[PDB]
């Protein structure tokens, strides 16, 4: 359902349609068991465009790899080699993400 700020708690697919430097974000996490987060969104780039994800998003999958255990390394290569058209899962956790960003 829909949280208090309009955007969904639940997972969520994104379709990004990639530009000339990438998908327009960077993520933090991917080590001690902090998954994925979306970090940054570039402005004018792809996901500002797309205007769907959010700081705070952890990205779950990327063209169906599970990345909620992955590596930084191995999150930030599948993002690379997704192609120009790009399925992310995201779900958002401004909480959590503070928690481990703190």
């Not at 955007?7 to 969520?12: G, L, M, Q, S, T």
């Not at 530009?19 to 570039?42: Q, R």
């Amino acid at each position: 359902g829909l949280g208090e700020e309009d955007i969904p708690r639940e997972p969520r697919r994104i379709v990004i349609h990639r530009g000339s430097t990438g998908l327009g974000f960077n993520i933090v996490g991917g080590e001690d068991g902090e998954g994925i987060f979306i970090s940054f969104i570039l402005a004018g780039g792809p996901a500002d465009l797309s205007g769907e994800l959010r700081k705070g998003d952890q990205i779950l999958s990327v063209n169906g790899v599970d990345l909620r255990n992955a590596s930084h390394e191995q999150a930030a290569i599948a993002l690379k080699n997704a192609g120009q058209t790009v399925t992310i899962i995201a779900q958002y956790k401004p909480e959590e993400y503070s928690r481990f960003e703190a």
